[PDB]
């Protein structure tokens, strides 16, 4: 539930977003600090979902 939102740490893995984006099941995709096309081109310290 939204008042107990599920928070997950992601680190130490290959992050390929092509499959995560090419699915048509999504209907709202707003990225703010980074343009989506650059997503497969960077490295990060840690990820939260």
């Amino acid at each position: 539930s939204v008042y107990a939102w599920n928070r997950k740490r992601i680190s130490n893995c290959v992050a390929d977003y092509s499959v995560l984006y090419n699915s048509a099941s999504f209907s709202t995709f707003k990225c703010y600090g980074v343009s989506p096309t650059k997503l497969n081109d960077l490295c990060f310290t840690n990820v939260y979902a």
């Binding site: 984006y21 090419n22 048509a24 209907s27 995709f29 989506p36």
Partner: protein
């Protein structure tokens, strides 16, 4: 330009967006000083058969 798309992916028509239809079926330049208009066609194009 005229065509017919799945009703879900309308938001992929906007310039600078990405996605399967935008990535490798149809996409617009960086500026695209034109206009876009889309409308429902489930009563004429869609066939119950």
């Amino acid at each position: 330009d005229s065509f017919v798309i799945r009703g879900d992916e309308v938001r992929q028509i906007a310039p600078g967006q990405t996605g399967k239809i935008a990535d490798y079926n149809y996409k617009l330049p960086d500026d695209f000083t034109g206009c876009v208009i889309a409308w429902n066609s489930n009563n004429l194009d869609s066939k119950v058969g």
